[PDB]
């Protein structure tokens, strides 16, 4: 999969989409639909479908929803307030977690300002908490912005 701070973005296009194989697969731990209830998906047509992908903790799946707050929805991935699609989530302990700790899945924990919806930020500048300038080196009130 893809990190949480640089999510992916696939633009599904002209095709025949069968959201029933999704809806009834029973392998998903979370399948919420917001703009439109799930059973009526296989009876509507749009212009574009986008699919974003990433990996988070188990109890941060509550912040992937319109109108939430927290380290994830504030500055990692923000959903607009009139969302239309659906959110799907499933546990993946056996694939992504490895003995000794899988330190390849990072997230951003400091940013100047919360994200605009569907905005993305892969920069790696040293964050500056206090008033003292940082000059690209770590120290008190000068923190690296990514944790794992």
């Amino acid at each position, epitope marked *: 999969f893809a990190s949480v701070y640089a999510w992916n973005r696939k633009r599904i296009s002209n095709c025949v989409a069968d959201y029933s194989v999704l809806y009834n697969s029973a392998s998903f731990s979370t399948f919420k639909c917001y703009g439109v209830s799930p059973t009526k998906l296989n009876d509507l047509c749009f212009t574009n479908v986008y699919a974003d992908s990433f990996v988070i903790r188990g109890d941060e799946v509550r912040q992937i929803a319109p109108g939430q*707050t927290g*380290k994830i929805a504030d500055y990692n991935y923000k959903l607009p307030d009139d969302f239309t699609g659906c959110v799907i989530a499933w546990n993946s302990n056996n694939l992504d977690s490895k003995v000794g700790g899988n330190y390849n899945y990072l997230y951003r924990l400091f940013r100047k300002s919360n994200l605009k919806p569907f905005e993305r930020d892969i920069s790696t500048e040293i964050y500056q908490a206090g008033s003292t300038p940082c000059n690209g080196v770590e120290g008190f009130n000068c923190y690296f912005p990514l944790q794992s």
Partner: nanobody
Amino acid sequence: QVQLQESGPGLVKPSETLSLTCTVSGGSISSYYWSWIRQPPGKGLEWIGYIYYSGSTNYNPSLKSRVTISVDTSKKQFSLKLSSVTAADTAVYYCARLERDWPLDAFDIWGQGTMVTVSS
């Protein structure tokens, strides 16, 4: 705003079951985790289980097979019952919240503890 507050007695001899509660003041049950934390005199802290609210649990295997936590969401109580105490558990007992949602973790607003002696 929200504060905690202990309860319950303690003076019972050795080898019994004690009880404590942590009635919530400002009102926030049903959303967080709530745990109990020991501290002997002059020594470092410790930890015991917690209880979500809907579901539940217990923890700290070193103290396992002795401790049971329960929750009454109506009047906002945690019961904690340890059994067959040993006068080595003569300590202060805090009931700090916990924190999720916004990761944070660690703990949060505590509760002034309760000296609980165990002897004759």
